[PDB]
Amino acid sequence: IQDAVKFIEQGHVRVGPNLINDPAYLVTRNMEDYVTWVDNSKIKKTLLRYRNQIDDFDFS
Amino acid sequence: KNSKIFSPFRIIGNVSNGVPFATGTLGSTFYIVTCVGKTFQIYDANTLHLLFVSEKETPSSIVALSAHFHYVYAAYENKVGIYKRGIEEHLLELETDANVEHLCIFGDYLCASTDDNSIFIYKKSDPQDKYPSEFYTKLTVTEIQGGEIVSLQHLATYLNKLTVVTKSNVLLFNVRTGKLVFTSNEFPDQITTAEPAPVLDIIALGTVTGEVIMFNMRKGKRIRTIKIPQSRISSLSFRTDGSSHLSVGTSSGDLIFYDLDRRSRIHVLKNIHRESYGGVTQATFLNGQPIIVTSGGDNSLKEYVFDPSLSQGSGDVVVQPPRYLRSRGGHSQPPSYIAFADSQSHFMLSASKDRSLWSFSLRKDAQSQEMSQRLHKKQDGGRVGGSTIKSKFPEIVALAIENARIGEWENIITAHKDEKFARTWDMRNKRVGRWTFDTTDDGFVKSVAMSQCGNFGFIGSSNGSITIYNMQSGILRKKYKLHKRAVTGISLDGMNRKMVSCGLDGIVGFYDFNKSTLLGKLKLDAPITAMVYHRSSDLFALALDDLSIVVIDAVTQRVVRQLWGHSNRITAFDFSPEGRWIVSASLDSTIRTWDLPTGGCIDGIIVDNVATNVKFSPNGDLLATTHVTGNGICIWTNRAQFKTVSTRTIDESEFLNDIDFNTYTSLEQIDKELLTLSIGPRSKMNTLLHLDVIRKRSKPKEAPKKSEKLPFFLQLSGEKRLGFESHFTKQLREGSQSKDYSSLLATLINFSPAAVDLEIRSLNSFEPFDEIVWFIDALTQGLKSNKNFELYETFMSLLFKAHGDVIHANNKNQDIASALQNWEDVHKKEDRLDDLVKFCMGVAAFVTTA
Amino acid sequence: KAGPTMAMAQNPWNAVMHLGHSNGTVSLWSPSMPEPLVKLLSARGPVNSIAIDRSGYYMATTGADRSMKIWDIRNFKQLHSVESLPTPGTNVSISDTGLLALSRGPHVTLWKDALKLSGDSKPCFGSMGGNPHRNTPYMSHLFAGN
Amino acid sequence: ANLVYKLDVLSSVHFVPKPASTSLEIRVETPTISMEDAQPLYMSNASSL
Amino acid sequence: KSDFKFSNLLGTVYRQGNITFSDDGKQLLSPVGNRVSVFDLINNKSFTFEYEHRKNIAAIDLNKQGTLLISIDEDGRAILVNFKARNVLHHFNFKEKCSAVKFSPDGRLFALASGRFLQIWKTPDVNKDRQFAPFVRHRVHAGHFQDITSLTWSQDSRFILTTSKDLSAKIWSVDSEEKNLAATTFNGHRDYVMGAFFSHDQEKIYTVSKDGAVFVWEFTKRKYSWRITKKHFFYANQAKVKCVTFHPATRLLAVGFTSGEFRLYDLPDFTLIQQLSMGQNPVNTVSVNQTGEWLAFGSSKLGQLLVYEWQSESYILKQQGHFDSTNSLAYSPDGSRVVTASEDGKIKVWDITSGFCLATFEEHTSSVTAVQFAKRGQVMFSSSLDGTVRAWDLIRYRNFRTFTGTERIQFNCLAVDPSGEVVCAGSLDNFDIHVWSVQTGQLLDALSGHEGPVSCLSFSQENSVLASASWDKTIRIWSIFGRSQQVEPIEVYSDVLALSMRPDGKEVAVSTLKGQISIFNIEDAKQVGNIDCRKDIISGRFNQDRFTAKNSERSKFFTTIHYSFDGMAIVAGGNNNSICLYDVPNEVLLKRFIVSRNMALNGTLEFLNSKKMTEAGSLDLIDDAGENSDLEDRIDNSLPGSQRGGDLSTRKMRPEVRVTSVQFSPTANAFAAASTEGLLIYSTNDTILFDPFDLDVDVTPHSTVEALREKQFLNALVMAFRLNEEYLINKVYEAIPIKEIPLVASNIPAIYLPRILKFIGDFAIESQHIEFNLIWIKALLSASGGYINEHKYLFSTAMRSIQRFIVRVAKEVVNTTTDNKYTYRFLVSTDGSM
RNA sequence: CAUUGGUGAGCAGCGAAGGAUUUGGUGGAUUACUAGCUAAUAGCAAUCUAUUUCAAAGAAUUCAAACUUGGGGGAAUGCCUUGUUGA
Which three-class secondary structure string do you get for B437-476?
EECCCCCCEEEEEECCCCCEEEEEECCCEEEEEECCCCCE
Cβ of residue B835 closer than 8 Å to a chain E Cβ: no
* Contact between E544 and A24 using a beta-carbon 8 Å cutoff: no
Question: CB of E122 within 8 A of CB of E102?
Answer: no
Contact call for residues E120 and E135 (beta carbons, < 8 A): no
Q: Which of B30, B51, B43, B41 is nearest to E93 (CA)?
A: B51
Helix axes B832-848, E792-805, angle to 10 degrees: 150
The answer to whether C60 touches C70, Cβ cutoff 8 Å, is yes
- Determine the protein residue whose CA lies at the shortest distance from the C1' of F56: E225
**Looking at chain B, after which residues does the C atom sit over 2.5 Å from the next written N, breaking the chain?**
655, 720
CB B64 within 8 A of CB B72: no
Angle at B322 between CA B321 and CA B325, to 5 degrees: 140
Name every chain A residue with its beta carbon within 8 A of the beta carbon of D17: none
Cα dihedral angle (E601, E602, E607, E610), rounded to 10 degrees?
100
Question: Judging by DSSP bridges, how do beta strands E314-320 and E304-309 pair with one another?
Answer: antiparallel
How many angstroms separate the CA atoms of B462 and B439, rounded?
A: 9
Residues of chain A with C-beta less than 8 angstroms from the C-beta of E643: 20, 22, 25
Residue nearest to nucleotide F59 (CA to C1'): C44
The residues, ordered by sequence, that sit 6+ positions from B149 with a Cβ below 8 Å of its Cβ are B101, B102, B113, B117, B119, B141, B164, B165, B166
User: Is C70's Cβ below 8 Å from some Cβ in E?
Assistant: no
Calpha distance B513→B502 (Å, rounded): 16
Non-local (6+) Cβ contacts of E706 within 8 A are none
Q: What is the 3-state secondary structure (H, E, C) of B381-393?
A: CCCCCCCCCCCCC
- E strands present in E617-669: 659-664
Count helices and strands (H / E) in chain D: 1, 0
Classify residue E770 by its DSSP letter: H
Longest dimension (CA), chain C: 53
**Distance of alpha carbon B785 from alpha carbon E391, whole angstroms:** 48
Q: How far is the CA of B670 from the CAs of B789, E460, E769, in angstroms? A: 14, 45, 8
CA B730 to chain centre: 60
Q: What is the dihedral of CA B670, B673, B675, B677, to 10 degrees?
A: 50
Smallest CA–CA separation between D26 and chain A, in Å? 38
The letter for the amino acid at B452 is Q
The answer for E 420-459 residues in CB contact with B (under 8 A) is none
Rounded to whole angstroms, what are the CA distances from C90 to B764, C99, E145? 73, 17, 10
* Cα C83 off chain centre by: 12
CB-CB neighbors (< 8 A) of E317 in chain D: 37-40
Contact: E782, B599; criterion CB under 8 Å:
no
Query: Chains touching chain C at 3 or more Cβ pairs under 8 angstroms?
Result: E
Of B746, B754, B775, B761, give the one whose Cα is nearest residue B690.
B754
Resolution of the experimental structure, in angstroms: 4.0
Between CA B498 and CA B491 the distance in angstroms is 9
Q: Is the dihedral of CA B339, B342, B345, B349 positive or negative?
A: negative
Of chain A, the end-to-end C-alpha distance in Å amounts to: 25
Distance C144 CA to F36 C1' (A): 9
Mutate: best of D13, D14, D15, partner A, most A CBs <10 A: D14
E729, E759 in Cβ contact below 8 A? Answer: yes
In sequence order, what DSSP letters do the residues of B727-778 get, joined into one string?
Answer: HHHHHHHHHHHHT--HHHHHHHHHS-HHHHHHHHH--S-SSS-HHHHHHHHH
Q: Do D12 and A25 touch (CB under 8 A)?
A: yes
- Residue E642 in contact with partner chain D when CB distance is under 8 A: yes
Strands C7-10 and C17-20: antiparallel
Q: Which residues of E touch C88 (CB under 8 A)?
A: 145, 166
Mapped onto helix, strand or coil, the DSSP state of residue B790 is: helix
Contact C22 E145 (CB under 8 A): no
Task: Tell which E residues from 406 to 435 touch D, by Cβ distance under 8 Å.
Answer: 407-408, 410, 428-429
**Do the chains contact at D34 and B693, CB–CB below 8 Å?**
yes
| CB within 8 Å of B323: residues ≥ 6 apart | B304, B305, B306, B307
Q: Is the dihedral of CA B368, B374, B378, B379 positive or negative?
A: negative
Whether E52 contacts E34, CB under 8 Å: yes
- Judged by a CB distance cut-off of 8 A, whether residue A52 touches chain D is no
* Distance, CA of D13 to CA of E385 (rounded, Å): 9
**A30: Cβ contacts below 8 Å, ≥ 6 apart:** D16, E428, E429
Which residues, in sequence order, are bridge partners of residue B111?
A: B104, B121
Name the packing angle between helices B770-785 and B742-750 (round to 10°): 90
Closest chain B residue to the Cα of E82, Cα to Cα: B642
The answer to whether the CB of B40 falls within 8 A of the CB of B54 is yes
Amino acid of residue B304: Y
E154 Cβ contact partners less than 8 Å away, ≥ 6 residues apart: E105, E160, E161, E198, E202
Distance from chain centroid for Cα E785? 37
Give the separation between CA B374 and CA B351, rounded to whole angstroms.
16
Query: Beta-carbon neighbour count of residue B462 at 10 Å?
Result: 20
Of E513, E796, E806, nearest to E666 by C-alpha is E796
Q: Write out the H or E segment, with its range, that includes residue C146.
A: none
Distance, in Å, from the CA atom of B711 to the CA atom of E354, rounded to the nearest integer, reads 38
DSSP assignment of B555-621, as one string? SS-SEEEEEE--SS-EEEEEE-TTSSEEEEEETTTEEEEEETTTTEEEEEE--SS-EEEEEE-SSTT
- Is residue E190 a contact partner of residue E211, using CB atoms and an 8 Å limit? yes
CB pairs under 8 A between B and E: 294
Question: In one letter, which amino acid is E676?
Answer: T
Amino acid B381 CA to nucleotide F7 C1' distance, rounded Å: 21
| CA B407 vs CA B403, B496, B788, C50: distances in Å | 9, 21, 60, 59
Tell me if E190 and C87 make a contact (CB, 8 A cut-off): no
CA-nearest residue of chain B to E691? B537
In sequence order, which residues have a C-beta less than 8 Å from that of residue E48 and are 6 or more positions away?
E6, E7, E8, E9, E32, E35, E36, E37, E38, E355
* Cβ atoms of E741 and E779 closer than 8 Å: yes
Please name the residues in contact with B461: beta carbons below 8 A apart, sequence gap of 6 or more.
B439, B441, B443, B444, B445, B446, B467, B486, B487
Backbone angle region of E715, left / alpha / beta, with phi > 0 → left and psi within -120 to 50 → alpha: alpha
Print burial letters for C24-49: b (CB count within 10 Å at least 16), e (below 16).
Answer: bbbbbbeeeeeebeebbebbbbbbbb
State the amino acid at position B210 in one-letter form. Answer: G
> Using the 8-state DSSP alphabet, how is residue E807 labeled?
I
Angle at B127 between CA B125 and CA B130, to 5 degrees: 80
Calpha distance B63→B41 (Å, rounded): 14
Contact present, B301 and B48 (Cβ < 8 Å): yes
In terms of Cβ atoms closer than 10 Å to its own Cβ (0-12, 13-18, 19+), residue D27 is exposed
- Residue E546 CA to its chain's centroid (Å): 33
Identity of the residue numbered E212? G
C88 to chain E: nearest residue by CA?
E145
Measure the CA angle with vertex B21, ends B16 and B27; round to 5°. 115
Q: Please report the residues numbered 7 through 46 in chain D whose beta carbons come closer than 8 angstroms to any beta carbon of chain B.
A: 31, 33-34, 36, 38-42, 45
Identify, with chain letter, the residue nearest to nucleotide F14 (CA–C1'): B382
Straight-line distance from CA B360 to C1' F35, in Å? 23
Q: Which residues pair with E161 in a beta bridge?
A: E152, E171
C-alpha distances in Å from residue E587, one per residue of B471, E528, E664: 19, 11, 19
Judged by a CB distance cut-off of 8 A, whether residue B618 touches chain E is: no
d(CA B13, CA B635): 11
CA distance B122 to B103: 11
Cα of D23 to nearest chain A Cα, Å? 29
Residue D27 in contact with partner chain A when CB distance is under 8 A: no
Best C62, C66, C67, C85 member to test E by mutation, with max E CBs in 10 Å, is: C66
In a 13 Å sphere around the CA of E613, the CA atoms on its Cβ side amount to 9
Extract the runs of DSSP E, i.e. beta strands, from chain A.
Answer: 13-15, 18-19, 35-37
| Cα distance between the two ends of chain B | 63
Beta B109-114 vs B100-106: how paired, if at all? Answer: antiparallel
**What radius of gyration do chain C's Cα atoms show?**
15
Whether E643 and A17 lie within 8 Å, measured CB to CB: no
Position B792, amino acid: Y
Q: How far is CA B595 from CA B538, B562, E643, in A?
A: 16, 11, 55
Q: Which of E506, E501, E511 is nearest to E526 (CA)?
A: E506
- Amino acid in the structure at residue B325: L
What span, in angstroms and rounded, lies between the C-alpha atoms of E642 and E654?
12
> At C140, is the secondary structure helix, strand, or coil?
strand
CA gap B184, B169 in Å, rounded: 5
CA distance B338 to B581: 19
Residue contact A30–D16, C-beta within 8 A: yes
Looking at the C1' of nucleotide F16, which residue has the nearest alpha carbon?
A: B387
Counted residue by residue, chain B has a size of 850
- How many other C-beta atoms are found inside a 10 Å radius of the C-beta of residue E790? 11
* Long-range contacts, stretch B164-173, CB < 8 angstroms, 24+ apart: B164/B113, B164/B119, B165/B191, B165/B194, B165/B203, B165/B205, B166/B141, B166/B191, B167/B191, B169/B145, B170/B203, B170/B205, B170/B215, B170/B217, B171/B141, B171/B145, B171/B146, B172/B217, B173/B119, B173/B139
CA of E172: nearest nucleotide by C1' is: F41
| C-alpha distance from residue E573 to each of B331, E1, E323, E498, E555 (Å) | 43, 18, 19, 10, 10
Q: Which of B689, B694, B797 is the mutation pick for testing D, counting most D CBs within 10 A?
A: B694
Q: What are the Cα distances from residue E118, in Å, to B248, E139, E140, E164, E206?
A: 47, 9, 6, 10, 20
Nucleotide at minimal C1' distance from the C41 CA: F59
Q: In chain A, which residue's Cα lies nearest the Cα of E574? A: A18
CA E152, CA E100: separation in Å to the nearest integer?
9
Distance CA E138, CA E122 (A): 6
In the Cβ-directed half-sphere of E375, how many Cα atoms lie within 13 Å? 16
Instruction: DSSP letter for E806, please.
Output: I
- Please name the nucleotide lying closest to E79, CA to C1': F32
Which residues from D are below 8 Å from E when comparing CB atoms?
5-6, 8-20, 27, 32, 35-44, 46-49
User: Using CB atoms, which residue from A26, A30, A31 is nearest to D10?
Assistant: A26
Tell me which H or E stretch contains B820: helix B816-827
**Of how many residues is chain D composed?**
49
E187 contacts in C (CB within 8 Å)?
A: 45, 65
Is beta strand C39-41 parallel, antiparallel or unpaired with respect to B335-340? unpaired
CB contact burial B637-667 (16+ within 10 A = b; e otherwise) = bbbbbbeebebeebbeeeeeeebeebebebe
Query: CA(E110)–C1'(F42) in Å?
Result: 21
Angle at B695 between CA B693 and CA B697, to 5 degrees: 70
**CA angle at residue E791 from E787 to E792, to 5 degrees?**
110
Nucleotides of F under 7 A from a protein CB: 13-21, 26-46, 48-61, 64-68, 79-80
Q: Map residue E8 onto helix, strand or coil.
A: strand
C-alpha to C-alpha distance for B578 and B548, rounded to whole angstroms: 22
Q: d(Cα B550, Cα C54) in Å, to the nearest integer?
A: 93
Quote the crossing angle between the two packed helices B789-802 and E811-829, to the nearest 10°: 40
Nearest CB neighbour to A10, from listed E428, E452, E546 = E546
**Burial grade of B614 (CB within 10 A; 0-12, 13-18, 19 or more):** buried
CA-based diameter of chain A, in Å? 34
DSSP structure string for E261-293: EEEEEETTTTEEEEEEE--SS-EEEEEE-SSSS
Tell me the three state secondary structure of residue E757: helix
The Cα B116–Cα B131 span in angstroms is 25
The burial class, CB within 10 Å (0-12 / 13-18 / 19+), for B812 is: exposed
